[PDB]
Amino acid sequence: GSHMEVFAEYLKGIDHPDHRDRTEEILSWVAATFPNLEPQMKWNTPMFSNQGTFIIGFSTSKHHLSVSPEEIGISQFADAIAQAGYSATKGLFRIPWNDPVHYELLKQMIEFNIQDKE
Template identity: 35%
Template sequence: MAKFESVEDYLNSLESPKHETLRAVIRAIETHFPEAEFKLAWNVPQVQIQGKYVFGMSAAKNHLSLAPWSEAVMADFAPRLAGYETTKGLIRIPVDWDVDQQLIADMISARMAELGI
């Protein structure tokens, strides 16, 4: 796997529709959390607010992954995530997902509350 220099490099390495879907996820986060910083960590895009990780994303061969960095948030959101494949720490979404901005915003808000920010 290539080592990326920036979130933009990461996104530009992806084929369509992965590129467009993750870009739409980022735009949704920017809309709800203008203070969010997008950084590359572990060679994939991560979101920090007040220096703390609140959300991450990555592309796999057949899906995209979204992660609120919290097993507790995943458990709390289990009813809303029932239509998705999940693990204790992430959600697998289709590469052409119709971005659920409110779900993302609510998960980040829950993670922020958990962190006290």
């Protein structure tokens, strides 16, 4: 249903427009490839919830965008992310604002985490 309205308040408050508009590509894309998720404003950050759970959250960084489903995305898939050209942490992965988000690699882990949490 409606979801942009939740997030489109936080997008405004990004005082950093030169890298803002990347963030909303993801917001609509999650709500398009993974429509079984629903929106939630929590911690002043963007998350979504499959019928209430925590299977995705992100937030803008001062030079990157910090993305993860829960943990597994940063455990096993983090090796593919390394050789794709990006760093992670233990708890999320990071693309730098200048360079593209690997939407593909990240769909794999979120859709996997969903099908695995049956």
